[PDB]
Amino acid sequence: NASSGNRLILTQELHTMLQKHLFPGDGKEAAAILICNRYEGGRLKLLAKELILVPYEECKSRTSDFIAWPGNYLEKAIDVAEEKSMSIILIHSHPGGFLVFSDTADSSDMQTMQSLFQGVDAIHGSAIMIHSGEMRARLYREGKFAENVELVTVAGDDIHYWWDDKLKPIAFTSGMTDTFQKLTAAIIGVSGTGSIVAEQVARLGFGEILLIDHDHIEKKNLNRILNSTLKDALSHRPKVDMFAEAIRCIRGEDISRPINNTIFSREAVLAAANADVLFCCVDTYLARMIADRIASSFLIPLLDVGVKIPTHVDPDDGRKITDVTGRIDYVKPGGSTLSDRLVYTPELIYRENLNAEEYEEQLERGYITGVEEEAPSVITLNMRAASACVSEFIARCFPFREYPNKRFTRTFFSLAGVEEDYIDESSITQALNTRLAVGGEEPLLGLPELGDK
Amino acid sequence: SSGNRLILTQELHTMLQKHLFPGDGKEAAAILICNRYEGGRLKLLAKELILVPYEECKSRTSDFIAWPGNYLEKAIDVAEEKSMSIILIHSHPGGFLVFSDTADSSDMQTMQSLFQGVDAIHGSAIMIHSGEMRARLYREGKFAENVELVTVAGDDIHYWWDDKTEQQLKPIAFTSGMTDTFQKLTAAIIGVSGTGSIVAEQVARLGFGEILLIDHDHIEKKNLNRILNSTLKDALSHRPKVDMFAEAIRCIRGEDISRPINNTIFSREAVLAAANADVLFCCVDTYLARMIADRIASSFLIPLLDVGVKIPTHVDPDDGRKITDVTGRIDYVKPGGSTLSDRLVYTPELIYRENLNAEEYEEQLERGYITGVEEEAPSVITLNMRAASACVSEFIARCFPFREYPNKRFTRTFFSLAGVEEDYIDESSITQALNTRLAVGGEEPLLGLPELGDK
Amino acid sequence: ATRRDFSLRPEDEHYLDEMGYCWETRLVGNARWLIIHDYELPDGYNHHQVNLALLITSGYPVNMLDMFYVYPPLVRVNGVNIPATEATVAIDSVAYQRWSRHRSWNPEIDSVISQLAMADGCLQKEVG
Ligand code: NA
Ligand code: NA
CATH class of the missing domain: 3.40.140.10 (Cytidine Deaminase, domain 2)
Structure with missing residues (x-):
């Protein structure tokens, strides 16, 4: 309706x-x-x-x-x-x-x-x-x-x-729902974190919910994906179709718009460009890069969330959990980008998109570094991060903190280290962003792969 | 299990x-x-x-x-x-x-x-x-x-x-070995609430063997913003909360592992079913419920994780009512350690005022003893999720230590979304009263409450 | 050869045209290959022209172009091998010599153009 x-x-x-x-x-x-x-x-x-x-x-x-x-x-x-x-x-x-x-x-x-x-x-x-x-x-x-x-x-x-139809409504109040009901939210990746973000967005009252993901439910990810079921795993159900149906059942209305595709596609980009907020919950550098380009080209606030459980191996005990961390990044149009914050880099994207045989041979040559081994993702950490990601959006639409929202542009918590840190937008260096508000100027997002004929 | x-x-x-x-x-x-x-x-x-x-x-x-x-x-x-x-x-x-x-x-x-x-x-x-x-x-x-x-x-x-092996090494968290331990255990979720629906979802998806669900309330359109797995059809059916979630776990796990108790915790049925669990997750925002959950934990030697959230509001003299703070609390009670009572999570005074007859409630209003004012804002899914995740994460950490400090430093946890601050209390800082119910079992009256007794 | 299976940046394409190259863009599986035919080399190699090739990575130009390729394989006219040029890569059933030459990539300025500039600078270096 209001979409x-x-x-x-x-x-x-x-x-x-x-x-x-x-x-x-x-x-x-x-x-x-x-x-x-x-x-x-x-x-x-x-x-x-x-x-x-x-x-x-x-x-x-x-x-x-x-x-x-x-x-x-x-x-x-x-x-x-x-x-x-x-x-x-x-x-x-x-x-x-x-x-x-x-x-x-x-x-x-x-x-x-x-x-x-x-x-x-x-x-x-x-x-x-x-x-x-x-x-x-x-x-x-x-x-x-x-x-x-x-x-x-x-x-x-x-x-x-x-x-146009217009004191300010405080947070967690009817006025909040009424603001959300007129907005469109894009969840890039319906993942361990993404599905939790999507659940919150649905139950908070957002009017339109885009779900962008190419993957399917599996017996492996039944321990993380909200609303997934054994039947969905045994039938290898697309994640977006699964969650689009759950939202319809929860909200009693067809507010979800499933996009069975990678964010790195004309379909997903041109659909995500309609949203009022982007929630990037994919754990690849290229995906985070595509999401950051959309945010600046179409002036959409972006919230990017990540989690990692690095593991080492002691010779006295064995495999140990090195750390249990999470990250929330809020990116406003014209401010510092995920690129500026090095959430992704050209080098980081290169190694990731190398073939299986390309990665190994480059690693043997010593030009590329090896990836860090990690433990299996867990529902609790995903939930800790996804709750903070959506809470960040509320705090920025309906300020309730005792400090300026600018102080918490980046957030890094640690369950093992029992420590949480914050970075201010003003301590991040910004590079020239000539692609700001260019919209769908071809090639889309500046990438020849995403271009039209 | x-x-x-x-x-x-x-x-x-x-x-x-x-x-x-x-x-x-x-x-x-x-x-x-x-x-x-x-x-x-x-x-x-x-x-x-x-x-x-x-x-x-x-x-x-x-x-x-x-x-x-x-x-x-x-x-x-x-x-x-x-x-x-x-x-x-x-x-x-x-x-x-x-x-x-x-x-x-x-x-x-x-x-x-x-x-x-x-x-x-x-x-x-x-x-x-x-x-x-x-x-x-x-x-x-x-x-x-x-x-x-x-x-x-x-x-x-x-x-x-009993079925242990030398070659079998103790596992780390977030790993397959964690699942095997959980598969043998029973967890009781007291309150399928905004937080308990989230605690229960995690417990089911972490592979716990048997999940008890205790709650009298039901699904309404007012709580389709917090209760996980709830659906508009259920709110139009006013479906019991424990029944809705029991069926949800059955579909998720492809097995009937949940035991729905459609009743309050203040019942002989609910206490006796909870007394079989290996861990208690108390997610009911009432003083009576939390007291009942603390009596169960000590009497039947079950670890208890009590979680609560609060969005306090204050009245600005010139601007009106505002959000004073957004907060959460996680308490871990070990059998024999300091109890929720010892931590003043509840008091006899708090449990008397909360549970007054309609005639008592009306007399207290008519005489000014109470104002009957909601000094809190509506609860939100995000804050419920932030506390529930930390609550279950506490259990993982106590069962499979991974923090850089001893788990004892975090016997109590408090966080502030507005103040952007989180505090921790050590079990050694808390004071302990004599626990006369520790390892007392189902000695009658149950939990020492005649109401709960068998007459 | 006017094969154009994919587009490059408009600036990349304006440059290749201005330079007068005979260049094609070929899809081989999911590999995007830019190939410049009859690339004139500096004196000092066994050959005087080669096919100069760049693998256009996925995410270009935010992803980086990492190396350059040349067919027929190249060796100094005196016969001494060129350092870090031993590996070969199949391109539509053609074994290209892979020059292992790496630099820093800046999406704000780096393109096919500058990577072609590196390639030339490396070719000049290995005869002088
Ligand atoms: Na700027
Ligand atoms: Na004691």
């Missing part, structure tokens, strides 16, 4: 810049222009890419209820958006009244929206911001008002959802 | 071990008076320990020992009232005799004399220096059956199986 409402996503950095320009302190209206890419999937997603600020000095009038700014900046925006038919969104301070003057004519808001369409054959919009940051937007189709943006959102250290 | 059992407290076992192995390499003896629980399986609840002084023993050799019979006799006098069991303990050899002022007795002759004095089952066991303990039993004074498992639930949990 096709259009979206307008800004990055934290861009929104912070916009808010500053729109509320400099003089109490007068200011103007700016967003240039957005689009993903026209199940729902329309406007992905803010470029920001033009209209300098106060160039404006002919600036008042607490009105502003008049020159159309040379509307021509700059059209020039930026002409090549890719990008969407242009005008932004103005809370009152919002404005005109656009040329040297020969003035343009009302409705006439300025007609001018944008004549310049670019695409959807365009007009938004308004209030002092606190909240935004509301109206989409104009074919130069004439049409629909309002159902959701304008910024996924920053805190996650912001500004609904 | 099945087998007659012999459970010893850590205190008794440690003191017993010390005597049996003083350090000279010579045999030592000791009588062990046990109480009995005769349920689905036999349970020998060691209650009293008699040590035989090395001086009293006429002789002590590396492979033999001979002690006076006046100690066999006095032990009989103590067991006469309740026809209690009498287990004779020895060292690695086991060879022994019981001399007297006039005549002497062999192993079997000594066994036959114990039965003559007390009409009950009496046996004889042997201990090695490591502490591992084998045993056997005699009924009517004649050889009967061997004890399948001698167990000690201390800071670490020790399971000494």
Whole structure:
């Protein structure tokens, strides 16, 4: 139901810049222009890419209820958006009244929206911001008002959802469910951890749940996969089909969307790109890499979770558990990526995708290092990690902690070491992310394998 | 899972071990008076320990020992009232005799004399220096059956199986060897609640042999956000919680391993079924339930893991009610150690206020003694899962140590999702009151509660 | 040979075209092979042209291109073997010489282009 409402996503950095320009302190209206890419999937997603600020000095009038700014900046925006038919969104301070003057004519808001369409054959919009940051937007189709943006959102250290139909609801409350009911969650990997994440997402009330996985239930994984059964293992049932049916039975509605495929596929990516949050629960580097590319290209907050039980072998006792650890990583669009945090690397992905004979011969040559041996995964550790992963999302949508959510960008706990650590977003080094808000620019995700013909 | 059992407290076992192995390499003896629980399986609840002084023993050799019979006799006098069991303990050899002022007795002759004095089952066991303990039993004074498992639930949990091998090495956690141990054990989940549904799911998926499920409540649309395996059809059917989950385990494990008890823990039916378990998981958020679970653990010498979560709220004078904190607690009670009572998890005052008649409740409101206000927020699946996983992980760690510190440091655990802090308490920091029910069995009234008695 | 079983990056493809190479992209099983035909070598080898090949790994260009391959096998004109060039790899039933040459990979800058640049730099090095 609430799974096709259009979206307008800004990055934290861009929104912070916009808010500053729109509320400099003089109490007068200011103007700016967003240039957005689009993903026209199940729902329309406007992905803010470029920001033009209209300098106060160039404006002919600036008042607490009105502003008049020159159309040379509307021509700059059209020039930026002409090549890719990008969407242009005008932004103005809370009152919002404005005109656009040329040297020969003035343009009302409705006439300025007609001018944008004549310049670019695409959807365009007009938004308004209030002092606190909240935004509301109206989409104009074919130069004439049409629909309002159902959701304008910024996924920053805190996650912001500004609904059209709109104190803040506290956590674990009805208002929380109502926010989740309008959202779509993607679970990449319906695994030991993934199936626990999926269960929580279902019972928490999310409106749409994508399940991406190629694997099947087996007698081996009947000790970890929630809602799996002996019958499913003996019939080698796809994991997504199994869990899609369980959600339907639990929620009494077909909210699940099973994707029987690897995340590394056009089908899974283009489906995951519709989600409002990504839960990466695959234990491969390549999978974590694909999930991190989706998050930046389609401005989707990503939560990546991992667990590991490394084992050694003592000559006096025998095989021993070295450590019992877990990791939760939250990745906001524009902030540090999983690549920045070295969750995966080119070297790490190479060794993994080597053949069985390729891996051994390279290992003999000493160019590649050997993989670390580990114990069998256990349901308890998976459960400890998956509960923290989903709790991280709640804390960022409905802050309840005694410290800024930024302090817990990365989390590393240890059941054996009985120790838990946290890393701040500000202590992680970020590399240039030119692929931010590019959407489905081909080749998809920048990978020629995922490209169209 | 099945087998007659012999459970010893850590205190008794440690003191017993010390005597049996003083350090000279010579045999030592000791009588062990046990109480009995005769349920689905036999349970020998060691209650009293008699040590035989090395001086009293006429002789002590590396492979033999001979002690006076006046100690066999006095032990009989103590067991006469309740026809209690009498287990004779020895060292690695086991060879022994019981001399007297006039005549002497062999192993079997000594066994036959114990039965003559007390009409009950009496046996004889042997201990090695490591502490591992084998045993056997005699009924009517004649050889009967061997004890399948001698167990000690201390800071670490020790399971000494009859079917053991030298080549068979003790296993590590999260490994196949863990599954084999669990397959022989029975776990009782008290409350198929938001947390207990999660504890029970893990227990079933970790391969436990028999799973008891005790709960009177049922599935409603209000708890389809927490109860694992529950389904909208069940909430429209108001299906009993223990029935829904029993069928879920049957499908998961392809076997009928769960025993659904559709009743409260405050019932003769539920206590007597729980008294057969090897571990108790208390997941009921009431003071009465937790007290009942703590009385079971001490009376029937079962390790208990009590888990609770709380989302406390406070009223900001200008902003309204907020979430003060999001928290969880895990308590591990070993038979003979500090109890939930000793840790103030409940008090008589707390259990009185909670369980007041509708007339009492109304009078207290009308007079201001109570306000009847919900000082907590709704529970969430994520917090239930964070506590349940740590609860079962505690059991794995006590059965198969893997932490870098002694398990004793973590007798109590407290975590704070909001304060982002986790604290631990040591069993040595806690204070212990006299436990008058330790290894008391099903002596009536059950658990010392007349309500639970048989009238 | 205009075989094009898969696409590379658009920048990779613009480069190969600008360089005038006769290049093909061939699927062999699940192996993606880029093959440049008649690659002119520097003087000093037994041969003067070879087929220069790169295995396009899965996840490229975030996954790294690790080595380069050459057929016919190459040896210095004096006959002395080239270090770390002993292994061979079947490419559509052709035994290519595998040059074991490794570097650091940076997805922000590394592509077919720079890996072809390494390959040339290594070929220049082993005759000089
Ligand atoms: Na940035
Ligand atoms: Na004590």
